[PDB]
Design a protein around this nucleic acid. Structure first.
Lengths: 125, 125
DNA sequence: GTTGCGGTTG
DNA sequence: CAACCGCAAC
């Protein structure tokens, strides 16, 4: 057929997973500009659950929404993943991506995204 | 691939691991919006279910845990000391096999824990 | 439920 | 400047 969907990917801190590129700065509770995806390099059975958690040295555990997804063809696509918790001025969250195989495989993505109440804003006066 | 080619070295050398290899402040991050009493229940229920979510507080590194190699007293230990549960959870973190070991006060819902290099698992990888 | 933008503040 | 708080307009 056509073939073409993972999008823009970056390495995670794990040698077994890549994930979508996230905006550097985004608004809290706001739908992301792309749909967050986790791509597995090594074989991973379909249906394996994948979750996202976030934290940093200021918010030890950020509140998220729709942070669970399932692997289908090596790709776990999140529908509407959102960051609700704030990360702190000049700071960004460290993500924890967990792929539930036995045992689970975990991949972090450091300084992945800064979440603020307003999100990116044009200077203003 | 699931692991990097030299697990032990990654674990003993990268700051990511080193910061987590000595015991430190951890804390249950589940159901953060519910009243504390519930969080206490939720915590234990799920523990008996061989799972839970905890963050290494100082760095904000979050992890979902699976306490299996129903859980065993070896992985979910309730006797050993009262008022708190002792947990063990193997996983592949950023390509290196490790075991997460820590304890949690069943009342405050916080505690101490650290990451331990799991050499047996590593060699089998 | 979403968004953009003014008032403020450190 | 870059946060936060608020909230009018849809």
């Amino acid at each position: 057929v056509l073939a073409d969907h993972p999008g823009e990917l970056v390495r995670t801190d794990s040698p077994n997973f890549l994930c979508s590129v996230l905006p550097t700065h985004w608004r809290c509770n706001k739908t992301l500009p792309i749909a967050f995806k986790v791509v597995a390099l090594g074989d991973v059975p379909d249906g394996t659950l994948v979750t996202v958690m976030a934290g940093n040295d200021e918010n030890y555990s950020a509140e998220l929404r729709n942070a669970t997804a399932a692997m289908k063809n090596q790709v776990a696509r999140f529908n509407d993943l959102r960051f609700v918790g704030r990360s702190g001025r000049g700071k960004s969250f460290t993500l924890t991506i967990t792929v539930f195989t036995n045992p689970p495989q975990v991949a972090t993505y450091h300084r992945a995204i800064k979440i603020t109440v307003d999100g990116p804003r044009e200077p203003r006066r | 691939p699931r692991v990097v080619p030299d697990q032990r070295s990654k674990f003993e050398n990268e700051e990511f691991f080193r910061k987590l290899s000595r015991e430190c402040e951890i804390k249950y991050t589940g159901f953060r919006d519910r009243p504390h009493e519930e969080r206490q229940a939720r915590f234990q229920n799920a523990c008996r279910d061989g799972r839970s979510e905890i963050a290494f507080v100082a760095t904000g590194t979050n992890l979902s845990l699976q306490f299996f190699p129903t859980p065993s007293r070896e992985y979910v230990d309730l006797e050993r000391e009262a008022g708190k549960v002792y947990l063990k959870a193997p996983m592949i973190l950023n390509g290196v096999c490790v075991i997460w070991k820590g304890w949690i006060d069943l009342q405050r819902l916080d505690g101490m824990g650290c990451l331990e290099f799991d050499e047996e698992r590593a060699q089998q990888e």
